[PDB]
Symmetry: C6
Subunit: 281 residues, 6 copies
């Protein structure tokens, strides 16, 4: 409770923001000055890692320390799924948020990290209620949609948030203490969570959107859809005029319901990263 609520709070305190994937301090500075609520330090970029296909690991501290020494706003970093020692090494680094990110090469195909044992807040991907709950029950402070990272395609990210919202609800308007008991056991999670969700109609944690956000339009689409905030990563920086696009997205995320404003910031944006349409995977 006390320990948790503090973690959730830090995460919860990021509501309405935009986190940005940064590769270098230069990039970090651009992101802070653009309105980013935080930055994700990493030495190589989602849209490149998904082609390599080399092992993608925790990023080198020096690299991170630098990025995190050149900005006021908090700094996130990535660790491989199940790679608790990588996480240990980053709690030590005094990073702000850790992200057990499925976009890197997993380290345990069977066990995620025991995030409870850490004092730093974690962020985790989910594509559905169960998965969401399992990660939360596992000690996840914050949650984001998975989506197809690096693709440039919202199709996925959106579908997820829809499902979670659809699932939370479906399961919600159902009947029996036993009916639930089952669903809790099924998705391998304490009855107490599934329950706080139904009693609150929403996860206990902040639910951000990640993977496939390339346009201000997209960002806004995901808030209108329910998300609590937005992860963009490159290719903001893989675009023609990053600084501009970066701001467009931050602005698009705060005013996500201002057709007039939205449009204003969606004009003369330049050429954006050529995504890879999910379908054609």
């Amino acid at each position: 409770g006390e320990d948790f609520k503090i973690k959730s709070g830090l995460a919860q305190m990021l509501k309405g923001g935009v986190i940005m994937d940064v590769v270098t301090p230069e990039q970090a500075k651009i992101a802070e000055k653009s309105g980013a609520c935080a930055v994700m330090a990493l030495e190589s970029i989602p849209a490149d890692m998904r082609k390599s296909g080399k092992v993608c690991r925790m990023s080198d501290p020096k690299m991170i320390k630098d990025i995190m020494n050149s900005v006021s706003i908090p700094v996130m970093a990535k660790v491989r799924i199940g790679h608790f020692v990588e996480a240990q090494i980053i709690e030590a680094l005094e990073v702000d948020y850790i992200d057990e990110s499925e976009v890197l090469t997993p380290a345990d195909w069977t066990h995620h990290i025991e995030k409870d044992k850490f004092k730093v807040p974690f962020v985790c991907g989910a594509k559905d209620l169960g998965e969401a709950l399992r990660r939360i029950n596992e000690g996840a402070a914050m949650i984001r949609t998975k989506g197809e990272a690096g693709t440039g395609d919202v199709s996925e990210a959106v579908k997820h948030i829809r499902r979670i919202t659809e699932e939370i609800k479906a399961c919600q308007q159902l009947k029996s203490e036993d009916d639930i008991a089952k669903v809790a056991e099924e998705m391998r999670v304490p009855v107490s969570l599934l329950k706080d969700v139904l009693e609150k109609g929403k996860l206990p944690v902040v639910n951000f959107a990640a993977g496939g956000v390339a346009t201000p339009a997209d960002a806004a689409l995901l808030m209108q859809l329910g998300c609590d905030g937005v992860f963009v990563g490159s290719g903001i920086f893989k675009s023609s005029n990053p600084v501009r696009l970066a701001t467009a997205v931050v602005e698009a995320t705060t005013h996500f319901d201002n057709p007039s404003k939205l449009l204003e910031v969606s004009s003369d944006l330049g050429e954006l990263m050529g995504g890879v349409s999910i379908e054609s995977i």
Copy 2:
């Protein structure tokens, strides 16, 4: 009723016309002066997007504003399927017609746009009655055949209009209030629509032909077949002598029953885009 019958009216008012895909103001002006009833502004061309295969998104407003600031006739633009925010941004732009076009990379594989909530008229693709009705019931002001966009092959476009006409009719000359009730539920649409169709023998909206029109001959073939108007897009402009072909098609569409005239405008036309025969897909 009232609100819609206005949207219908804008669409309905294009009867007999030819809408043209434009990529630049220069191209727009050529189209207008050619007899186009309107133009579809887009930064990249159906016949190229279907090869990329990059994510195809709403086009950049500046781009559109420009195209739409250089012509009297109305201007359409495209948004991804289900991407309501993209649409919101374009209502704002004050475009004339929006096209929720399946030729771009979809944004929701499960939900189209809630076009009712918009005041701008939408246009949608259909390959059959059900699909048609679903899009209309969803708020579609105007409807077009899908066909294989960019292929240069009528085979598809025609087949669709045939089916819709064949289906409208088949379902029409059938018997029981319950018989219908079923078909309405099946194609997931209010009994009231399927009904206005059967009572009128035709959709409540204008039904244009799109995808696979490359020759004046083709355009005429589709009107003789029942369509209310024609979408061409590039490769009018991917042809040897656009200006000439553009006019040929506009002319072929108005006089679509004048063998003498038709032929006149089908001569010395030059080399047209080398399509990609559906079959060989």
Copy 3:
């Protein structure tokens, strides 16, 4: 009857001849002077179209007008299957025979043209009795074997004529008015045709050979086999010494039973188009 018999007559009046695929007036003149009973005007050649694989359409009138303004003998042109407007445009052109040719990209995968409604004689491909009858019942004035066009291989052409002759006969020496009634309904045709065939032992129309004729020898082989005449197309012109080969085939077709003469015209012929053996498809 009256209207039909006139059409059949024009077609019937081509018996024993050789029709040649021409691409340019030069080529047309060569063909006339060679003994061709007619020429097929087209802007691109069977043996190339079957590789493209671009949409193959009706040819540009100017092109045809030219070819047909440089020769006394009649001129045929091609239109896509089911593309009635294309045909309309060519009746208008005052071409002599129209060929609803399956070698082009079809326009209707479900419906051929309503050739009845036209006053110009049509020619159609068939690979068997049923198909033959269906085209004839559909208004076909003349009929040709399909064969594998552009391949340079007789295997197919021959097989067809064999089958038609084999089928006409098989069905012929069978018993009951009901026995027939069935076969008529099966191959979706009026009992009256199947009947005139059996009563005459041959279709009511001329049956030419097309697709896969590359050598004088081949032409002769197809007449000995029953055909009423021969379509060659390129690669007469894709050969080393066209003029010579053209004549050889015209001559081989008239004297198709003159081993001495046949051989005379099959010598020092030069290098002919390198076909593509059906088998290796």
Copy 4:
């Protein structure tokens, strides 16, 4: 009887010989001077045709006339399976033997030639008794094994002669007039042939070996095995020292039981065509 027994005689008179594939007069003269009992005139070579894969046809007469005007020994030529007119053209040419050769692109996948109607002796491939009998019953004067032509591999040729010899025999030592009646109908042939075979223990015609003979050793192997003579074709000429190899094979075929002599002629032979091992097909 009479007519045939003359054709049989011309074929039968080649017993013990070697027929050679020639492509040019120069090649023909080399073959004659080497001891070839005859030559097979063709403009392109088995080992190349089986790669093309272009349509392989009867060869141009001039070509043949030339080859056959530069040698005393008889001259064979090829025609496509079922291509009776091609054959007609070659009877006319006054060639000595015609070979309805399956190595060329067939002209009728359903009917071989009616060799009875010809006065020139035919040669045909067979891989088994039935096939052999069918070709003979069809008017075949001479028969050869098929084998994988152009491969350089005896595996096949041998296997065939084994089977025919194995089959002739198997069927031979069986019992009932009805037992046979069946086998005759099965392999679609008059009871009278199957019968003359069993009563004589061998086909009524000469049975040569063809396809896959590359070495003197091979030739001898096939005679020891029962064949009545040998078809070699290139790559005698695709070898390093043709003249020598040609003679080696002729000599190896006559003295096919003289280990001492065989070996003598198998030495310092040079590099022979690099076959293509059946297996690796």
Copy 5:
């Protein structure tokens, strides 16, 4: 008992250490001076052999003698599975530990080596309890996880140690002398071993981690997980700054529970070998 407990002792004495793959003396000396408890002499490197795909054999003695003559710490060498003579040759060489390594091309797909008959201690790979026990029962002095060698990916190595630990335990807390009897026979091993394991909760031998260790972080992760020591091999040396990385790993392995220290040694490490993510196999 006695004989083995000596071999066990040599292996057991390496507890807590790091063994390193060396390819040359220069490399050996770097490894020794780095803190390596031993080195694995081999002429070609795991990450290259798994691409070749040439036969990978015991390494040439001279090569090894040299490597083992330039370092105080013990020296291991590899032999192919089942290749007892290769092993014999290396006992003779007076190497310290032999590794019957599945990373080389096996020599017997059916029988491992009879390591009992040797006086030198062997090391063997296992992915599960059974496999582990079978190798031990076979005379294995030391055991290591297999993991995907040369990949750079821990996913595997970890998964193994998890399973073994999971299996040892699962089987442990089960009930009947017969229950066990079965499992012993199943995994084809004496009841006496499975038993010493359950009675001790751990194998009788040291269990190192191998295959997929590329980062100090990884090494530490595997000790935290239960391993008794670490095999790294190249690409320590396939990295940018080997010396540094080598030390980092040795240090990371001893202080594998010192987040502060761990992180200290994980900074400014340079570019490491670009692994090949298991998944993408």
Copy 6:
């Protein structure tokens, strides 16, 4: 008996030796002077033939005569499976041993050679008892393991000898005269052989190892395993320092149980042929 025992004797007289694949007299001399008990004359090399994939035939006599005229020790040569005439030609040549070798392109997929009819001793490949017996029953004087020739991989060779030894034994300690009767009929061989084997516990002929021997270590491994002698072929000569390796293998074969000696001869051997690991086939 008498005739056989003489053949077996010559073969039997090769016990403990190493036969070497030679391509040229130079190579032959090197092999003799190295300690080879005999040489296998061939114009092209196992490790190359298995890539070609051209037909591999008996080698040209001159070639062999030369090789066999430049060495005292006996000389073997290869013939294709079932190619009895090739064998006849080589008996004539006065070669010492003939090898009906499956490494060349077979000549009869159904019948091996009737080696009984020859006075020269034959050698044959086998992978199991049955196969061994069938070849012996067929007149085989000597037998060798097959293994994957040219691969450089012992995996196979060893596996075979294991099986034969395993099979001989398995079948041996079984019960009934009828029990055996079956196994004899099954593996298509006289009860009398299977019987002499069981009564002697070993084939009546010498059993050498062949295919996949690349290292002295390998050779020794195969003797320890039961073989009576060793076929190496290239790539002894495809190695860096043939002369040395050749001797190493001869020496390794005689002293195959002298770890000290074995190792001595396995040092500073140079780079050996890069095999092709069976597995990766």
